[PDB]
Amino acid sequence: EVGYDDIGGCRKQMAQIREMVELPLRHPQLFKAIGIKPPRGVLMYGPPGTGKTLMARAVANETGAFFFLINGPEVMSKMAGESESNLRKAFEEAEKNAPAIIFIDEIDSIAPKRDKTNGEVERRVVSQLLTLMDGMKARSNVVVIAATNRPNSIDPALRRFGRFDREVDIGIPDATGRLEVLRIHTKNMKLADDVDLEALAAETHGYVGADIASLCSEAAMQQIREKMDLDSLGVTMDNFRFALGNSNPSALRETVVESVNVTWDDVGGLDEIKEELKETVEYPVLHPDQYTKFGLSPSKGVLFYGPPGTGKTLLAKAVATEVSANFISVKGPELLSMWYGESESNIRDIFDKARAAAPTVVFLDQLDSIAKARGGSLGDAGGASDRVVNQLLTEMDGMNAKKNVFVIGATNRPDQIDPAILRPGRLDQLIYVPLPDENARLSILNAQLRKTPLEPGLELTAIAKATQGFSGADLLYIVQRAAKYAIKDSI
Amino acid sequence: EVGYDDIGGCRKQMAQIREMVELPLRHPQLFKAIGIKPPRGVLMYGPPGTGKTLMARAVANETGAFFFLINGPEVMSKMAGESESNLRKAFEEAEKNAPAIIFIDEIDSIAPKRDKTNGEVERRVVSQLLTLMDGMKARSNVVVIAATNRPNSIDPALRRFGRFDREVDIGIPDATGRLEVLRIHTKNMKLADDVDLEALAAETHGYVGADIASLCSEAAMQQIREKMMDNFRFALGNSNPSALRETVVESVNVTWDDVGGLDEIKEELKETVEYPVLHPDQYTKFGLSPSKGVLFYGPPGTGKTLLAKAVATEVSANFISVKGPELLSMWYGESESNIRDIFDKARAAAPTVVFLDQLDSIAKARGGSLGDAGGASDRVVNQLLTEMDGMNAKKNVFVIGATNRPDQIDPAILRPGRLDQLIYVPLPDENARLSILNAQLRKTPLEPGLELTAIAKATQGFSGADLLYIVQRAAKYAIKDSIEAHRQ
Amino acid sequence: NGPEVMSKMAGESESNLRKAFEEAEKNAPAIIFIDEIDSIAPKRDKTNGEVERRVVSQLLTLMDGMKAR
Amino acid sequence: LSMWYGESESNIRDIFDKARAAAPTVVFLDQLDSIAKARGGSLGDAGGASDRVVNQLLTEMDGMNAKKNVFVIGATNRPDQIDPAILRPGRLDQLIYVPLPDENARLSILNAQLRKTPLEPGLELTAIAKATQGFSGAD
Amino acid sequence: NGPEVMSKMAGESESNLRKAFEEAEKNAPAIIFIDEIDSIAPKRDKTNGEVERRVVSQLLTLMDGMKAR
Amino acid sequence: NGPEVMSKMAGESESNLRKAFEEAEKNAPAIIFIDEIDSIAPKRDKTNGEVERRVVSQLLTLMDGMKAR
Amino acid sequence: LSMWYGESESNIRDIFDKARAAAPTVVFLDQLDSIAKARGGSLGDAGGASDRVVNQLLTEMDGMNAKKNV
Amino acid sequence: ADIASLCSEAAMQQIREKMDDSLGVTMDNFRFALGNSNPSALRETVVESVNVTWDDVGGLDEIKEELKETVEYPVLHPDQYTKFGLSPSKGVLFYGPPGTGKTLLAKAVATEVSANFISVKGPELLSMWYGESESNIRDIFDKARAAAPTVVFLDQLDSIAKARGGSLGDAGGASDRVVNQLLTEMDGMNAKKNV
Amino acid sequence: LSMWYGESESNIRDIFDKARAAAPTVVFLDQLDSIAKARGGSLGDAGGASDRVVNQLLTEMDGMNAKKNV
Amino acid sequence: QIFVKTLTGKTITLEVESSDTIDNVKSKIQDKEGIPPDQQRLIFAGKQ
Numbered sequence A: 001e002v003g004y005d006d007i008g009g010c011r012k013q014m015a016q017i018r019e020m021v022e023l024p025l026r027h028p029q030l031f032k033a034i035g036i037k038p039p040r041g042v043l044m045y046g047p048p049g050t051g052k053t054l055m056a057r058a059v060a061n062e063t064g065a066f067f068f069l070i071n072g073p074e075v076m077s078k079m080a081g082e083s084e085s086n087l088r089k090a091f092e093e094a095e096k097n098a099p100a101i102i103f104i105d106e107i108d109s110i111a112p113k114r115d116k117t118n119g120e121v122e123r124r125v126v127s128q129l130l131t132l133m134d135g136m137k138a139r140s141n142v143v144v145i146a147a148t149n150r151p152n153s154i155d156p157a158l159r160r161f162g163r164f165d166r167e168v169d170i171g172i173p174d175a176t177g178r179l180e181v182l183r184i185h186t187k188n189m190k191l192a193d194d195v196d197l198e199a200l201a202a203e204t205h206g207y208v209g210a211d212i213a214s215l216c217s218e219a220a221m222q223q224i225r226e227k228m229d230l231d232s233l234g235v236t237m238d239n240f241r242f243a244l245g246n247s248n249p250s251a252l253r254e255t256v257v258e259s260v261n262v263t264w265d266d267v268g269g270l271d272e273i274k275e276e277l278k279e280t281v282e283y284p285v286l287h288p289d290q291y292t293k294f295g296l297s298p299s300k301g302v303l304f305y306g307p308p309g310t311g312k313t314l315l316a317k318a319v320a321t322e323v324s325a326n327f328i329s330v331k332g333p334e335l336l337s338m339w340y341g342e343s344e345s346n347i348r349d350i351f352d353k354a355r356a357a358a359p360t361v362v363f364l365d366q367l368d369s370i371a372k373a374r375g376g377s378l379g380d381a382g383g384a385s386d387r388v389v390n391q392l393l394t395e396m397d398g399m400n401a402k403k404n405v406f407v408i409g410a411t412n413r414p415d416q417i418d419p420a421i422l423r424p425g426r427l428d429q430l431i432y433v434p435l436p437d438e439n440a441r442l443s444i445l446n447a448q449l450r451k452t453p454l455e456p457g458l459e460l461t462a463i464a465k466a467t468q469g470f471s472g473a474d475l476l477y478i479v480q481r482a483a484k485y486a487i488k489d490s491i
Numbered sequence B: 001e002v003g004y005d006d007i008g009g010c011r012k013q014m015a016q017i018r019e020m021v022e023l024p025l026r027h028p029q030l031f032k033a034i035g036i037k038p039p040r041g042v043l044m045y046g047p048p049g050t051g052k053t054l055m056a057r058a059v060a061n062e063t064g065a066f067f068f069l070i071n072g073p074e075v076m077s078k079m080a081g082e083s084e085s086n087l088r089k090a091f092e093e094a095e096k097n098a099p100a101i102i103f104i105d106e107i108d109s110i111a112p113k114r115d116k117t118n119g120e121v122e123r124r125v126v127s128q129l130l131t132l133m134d135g136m137k138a139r140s141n142v143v144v145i146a147a148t149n150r151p152n153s154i155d156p157a158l159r160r161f162g163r164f165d166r167e168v169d170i171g172i173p174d175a176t177g178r179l180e181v182l183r184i185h186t187k188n189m190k191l192a193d194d195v196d197l198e199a200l201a202a203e204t205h206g207y208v209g210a211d212i213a214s215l216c217s218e219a220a221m222q223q224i225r226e227k228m229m230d231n232f233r234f235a236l237g238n239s240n241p242s243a244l245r246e247t248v249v250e251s252v253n254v255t256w257d258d259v260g261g262l263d264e265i266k267e268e269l270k271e272t273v274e275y276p277v278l279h280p281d282q283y284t285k286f287g288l289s290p291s292k293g294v295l296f297y298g299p300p301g302t303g304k305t306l307l308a309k310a311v312a313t314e315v316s317a318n319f320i321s322v323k324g325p326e327l328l329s330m331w332y333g334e335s336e337s338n339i340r341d342i343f344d345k346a347r348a349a350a351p352t353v354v355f356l357d358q359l360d361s362i363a364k365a366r367g368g369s370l371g372d373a374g375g376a377s378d379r380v381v382n383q384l385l386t387e388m389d390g391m392n393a394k395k396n397v398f399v400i401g402a403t404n405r406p407d408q409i410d411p412a413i414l415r416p417g418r419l420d421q422l423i424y425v426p427l428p429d430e431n432a433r434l435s436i437l438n439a440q441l442r443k444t445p446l447e448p449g450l451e452l453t454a455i456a457k458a459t460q461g462f463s464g465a466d467l468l469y470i471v472q473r474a475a476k477y478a479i480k481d482s483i484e485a486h487r488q
Numbered sequence C, E, F: 001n002g003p004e005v006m007s008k009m010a011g012e013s014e015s016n017l018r019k020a021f022e023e024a025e026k027n028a029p030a031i032i033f034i035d036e037i038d039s040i041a042p043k044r045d046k047t048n049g050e051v052e053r054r055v056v057s058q059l060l061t062l063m064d065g066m067k068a069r
Numbered sequence D: 001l002s003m004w005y006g007e008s009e010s011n012i013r014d015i016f017d018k019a020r021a022a023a024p025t026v027v028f029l030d031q032l033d034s035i036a037k038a039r040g041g042s043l044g045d046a047g048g049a050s051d052r053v054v055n056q057l058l059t060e061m062d063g064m065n066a067k068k069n070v071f072v073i074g075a076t077n078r079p080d081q082i083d084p085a086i087l088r089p090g091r092l093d094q095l096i097y098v099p100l101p102d103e104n105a106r107l108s109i110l111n112a113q114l115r116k117t118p119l120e121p122g123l124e125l126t127a128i129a130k131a132t133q134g135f136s137g138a139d
Numbered sequence G, I: 001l002s003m004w005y006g007e008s009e010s011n012i013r014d015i016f017d018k019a020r021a022a023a024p025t026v027v028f029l030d031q032l033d034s035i036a037k038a039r040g041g042s043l044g045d046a047g048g049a050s051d052r053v054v055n056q057l058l059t060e061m062d063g064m065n066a067k068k069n070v
Numbered sequence H: 001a002d003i004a005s006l007c008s009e010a011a012m013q014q015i016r017e018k019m020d021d022s023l024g025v026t027m028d029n030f031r032f033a034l035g036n037s038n039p040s041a042l043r044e045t046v047v048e049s050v051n052v053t054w055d056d057v058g059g060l061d062e063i064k065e066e067l068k069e070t071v072e073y074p075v076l077h078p079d080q081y082t083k084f085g086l087s088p089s090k091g092v093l094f095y096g097p098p099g100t101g102k103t104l105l106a107k108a109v110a111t112e113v114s115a116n117f118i119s120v121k122g123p124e125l126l127s128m129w130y131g132e133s134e135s136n137i138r139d140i141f142d143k144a145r146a147a148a149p150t151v152v153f154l155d156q157l158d159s160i161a162k163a164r165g166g167s168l169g170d171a172g173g174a175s176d177r178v179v180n181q182l183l184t185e186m187d188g189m190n191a192k193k194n195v
Numbered sequence J: 001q002i003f004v005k006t007l008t009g010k011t012i013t014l015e016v017e018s019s020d021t022i023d024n025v026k027s028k029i030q031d032k033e034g035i036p037p038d039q040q041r042l043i044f045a046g047k048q
Ligand SMILES: Nc1ncnc2c1ncn2[C@@H]1O[C@H](COP(=O)(O)OP(=O)(O)OP(=O)(O)O)[C@@H](O)[C@H]1O
Pocket: A006, A007, A008, A009, A010, A047, A048, A049, A050, A051, A052, A053, A054, A055, A105, A106, A147, A148, A181, A184, A208, A209, A210, A213, B161, B162
């Protein structure tokens, strides 16, 4: 069985969750002569592969308590209301043995919020759980823990005083937490001298822990691949480098959400907008008390519009690399849905993930399909194109200033956008992105020549002097034309 | 009783399967020396009928282990109470008689995805499979093998870690792959020396391996009926090939020899769509690899789509034949969504050429006016401004584009992030008129006295499609010359 | 309680309701506190199955039987 | 309208009936161009899909009297984009128009939104507001 | 009464309806007053169901079928 | 007949299917006539639910092990 | 015609599948003065919808199966 | 069945004002039932034949003989159209001053032919929606085949020249779903029951 | 008459039960120019009021005789 | 140039599982179940 030393990386959340399980059971005398009652519910939530069920089994075997397990899709019946009788059956069985602990994983699968169903038996399933947890007058006997993945899909009646308080988010082990995961998994495998766990966590962005256990297993498959078939295999540094490219990270749901692996100097020229990008979320995160001292909210949104192909995807994804914040990627008409009632809730869950993943970076592309300043073309239909723009203009005003929420724009048409879209307080700085001049079009080609070994005999400004009003993407077309014009004889 | 030598084509994947299901079973102590546990779940996918069920029975009889089988649409059609006990009986019986394998098929019928159309059962069976598969790894000689048709309709909780981590893509075979299964399925039929094998495999070009058993029995039945052996070409004219009305059509086998002229387009298409798909070792150190977008414009009937299927059969890749008005636009939101899944299908079957026709409509989608549609032809170009440059270094896709009006090109679609390589397709001159027409009358048993230089002298401003009418009229009257030859 | 009723089999929630009001008046004064009554009686446009109609008409009949003071 | 069935005006039915039961309670109404824009017009809605929004906003007006302390406030950026039956007599007989702040009011705006600031009083906030003619309080 | 018929199942409710009409035949003249016919007979075409044509079809063959003056 | 045998239970339709093929083996030659295949196997574009794929999987199963005579 | 929007291209290719299944069939297109007149003359909002409905049959003339005697 | 409720309700009104053998039922009790009747069959076209003579209208005697020489001869014997190879008429027209008594002219054509008459309203081609402009106009046609011989009346036939090019995204069956079917449903007869 | 579907014609059904079971009755409709947006305007020489409520109105308002006092 | 979108909703089932009428159980008791091989059951006589 696993123990407390079986998992690392969440040492802050381990010591936090150990207070609410040991103190109601080991030393219950602290709740006496203080007046209050010890709480029961602990709520864990996060992405899959973070170790929610691993942390539940580790705290059970390390205390010797009467552990119990209640599964999400298992106890959900349609016969005669048997789910309402099997929930109270598990509560009286845990009450018969002291001390005890129950665990309800994927709690969003059992009776979610009623925005969709609203009429099924799950409305009467959750109300059974309300009177079951509130009728737990047996002090210091049963402690309930739960695990889910989306805290916004659950009904808000659970987040209350009695049943489920003191929620904790199991985050991502980025601050050398993957080194502790590699110390657990690779301590049983035979190792060599060339491997080093400090040179693995710096390159594995994300990597919640489940793919790290898949990475060391796939590195063992590469070691036994060369054996054609007394045995001394070991590992090597090239096995983990083979497992990086030949195995996908946690990105099967969405293609790119983290970054595109760029930096500051990958955009050609435009050193003035690099200075003005230092007034974005890089600035007020490490000092947010200065705006409370000066008594005014910071800048909310900066807008951009101009010629296409001048850095509205490079600089739009360079913010995801200069701070490595919780980036998201969403397209213009991908926000637009096929259903009419979803037209206002799709922007709601995106903005709710932004305040929950603070600090975050969001962006928008092709707002002409989203703004629609006339406000719906003709009408007459069961649904119209007017709630998609009138919802984000109010929801972005109903956000907390100290929660790292902002917007940034990338458009090509300055006439389809509404005047209230470019309103100050929502999108303040009307900054038209300019066409680069002859002083900035030399570093446009140098953005691609940083990674390729260009011969120094070729003049760098001779090809750049052929531009007399070109764009920043047009000099990529030259090195794309030269990508198929350089080889020419090696077939 | 099938063996290893009954199927081919996927031999590169058959070798990596033999180290996945036979190596942990025959040598379980090798994973003990390395420390880690052996893998439990490997799944297969692709088109159904490439031998998905025959592959599991071949490796079962070649190992001598126990072979447990749970059918997909059989155990899930019960009333949600016996399915959880059948899976409990499946893992308990395989543990009793180890070494054992567990083969399941059609797991998409057992494990669908959660979508907006809720109302199915969708639970109590896959969650039983979750709590059964995460255990049992106490060096037990058991493996599970899954099989499905659509690999993206499966629930993502299965393909996370420890349950189904290794995947194989058994797709359609190549020209040598269908040649290998043609020799397998014809080992008992007493054919004569008039039959071919390389030409019979090359004339199929899209045939799934289940069709080879049906096409052999159709030609053999025709030989039986004439008693009261080149009947294989009769079987292709009668039987319909599998994947009938999908976007994988291949029935026209025009190669680069059958199309003539336009040498400023043949070498300029070899530079972009055959170089990264064959030699990518130089493309990873000379900038970005793919040159996806290419535009074709010119007069009507200049030979745009004549070279569409010709490049698609040179590297023998898939050919997505999407017509012009394929944005069906039944509502307001699906018109931007039906163009995205065909781009994700191009990333799954990469590399794969995609075809479109006259979908540039952002110049007419001006800002702040009154005359406009209800969401189509003005916001689908905003999806076109974000779904075309959705590239990846592990796919190197390429998209061709043929139009007949270069004046209505959008100012945002003529960009290196979009279709940028525009090439004018000119009229065939006096040297290209002979190279096009002679390759089209190659199938005609003509007399060599009539030279086509007089046709090129009589056609000065004619297009190549108009020259195709001349050889059609010469063949239609050669039919009439053949009609008035057997009646007397 | 609200959700504790209707979770029975073979139709005995009405007998648990009929014995509830009969045993209360045998030792009067009595107080019958029905907690969470919204989980028992929804509207007729959001009806579910057939046992939901059977317990809302049993409650409406038995409520009228208390006119004997 | 997040739920496609029932929860379109039933989420407003506990606002109308509870305003007279839980008085005093002030209900603010905004975003008028996203509730009754195409449904109340001359073309309307054809099919009965989501025409259930302009009915409860009108039939709850005559059924509500001034027995308890009720108060509603409608605010929008386009007053002509709402249905004219919302401006029926008997309920909206008092129309108050908030105008643009002039030069005598824009200087006190800069003294209002600079409240919790360490502002030096030696400068002139009128000289900033004197260059604002078409510039509103957002500018 | 209305909801006392729907508080039972389909089997015993039709037997109780048949017993009421038999005792009133021998006790002529008699008045068989039924109450709350909306709970027994609602609008059927909006909810095309199974029980919406069960107790009313049993009543219709018993109401139109009786003839004894 | 198609909608006749499939309208019975799952175990009842399987027993009639199994007893028909073993009867056809002992009196060769025999002709097994099946009608209305569309009611047993419809298209899977929008026909949700899994009650039709149970019986058609047994038809393809029993059509295999009859190779010799 | 295109009453709503795009409600004609789905009603053009819906007869091509049954034209080759019950072969021999022919299809008789008649009175093309409502589609084959607008190539570059009409530049209105109906002309923008005219450019969307004429490329359906133009690509279906050479994209049809010509070996099923249609 | 409505007659059975008419005789019982009129007789019940006679009992009400007698007590307050001495019984007697007058016509005025049935006149009370006329003002208290229950019209049930209202959403159906009239299938009953009439007996109005052609002398009810005045004049236009030159067009009554032209209609008598076309349709009331083949309904008794259709051999006149087959001895020389001809077909009966499909549709007639009337045009001039609108609403000058063409409904009673449509009533009187079902008397010299000894058949029934079907009265379909004028603006029902535009008042009926999508599906209702197509299926309802052919659900009476096969009903007219079961009730043969009969005649059908239509009005406001000036919609063929104004509702042909239906491509607007506002109307349903009132713009384009009429012109696509009157060319087919008029020639979609069987030529054996003479509708 | 601006309620949900199904109840938009049942209100005029009550005034027809008032013509028969609760006679006499008086019907009155005000502001006939606001109801023209719901009824629809006839254009050209071939038009009509394609409305949901006018079919139940105009048929039974002429079938009732003078004794029902409509 | 417009659209019509509408969703749906369902109710699954409820059950009671009521069976075993009393007249079937009274016939269920008075029967036999079989006896191995040589487990005779006997007769007996007396009271002359
Ligand atoms: N300390 C740790 N932190 C994070 N991951 C870990 C740790 N130790 C092991 N892991 C890996 O992460 C996985 C734990 O994931 P787990 O089984 O909890 O899935 P889960 O989705 O969190 O569970 P549930 O289904 O209850 O949500 C294991 O497979 C293990 O290899």
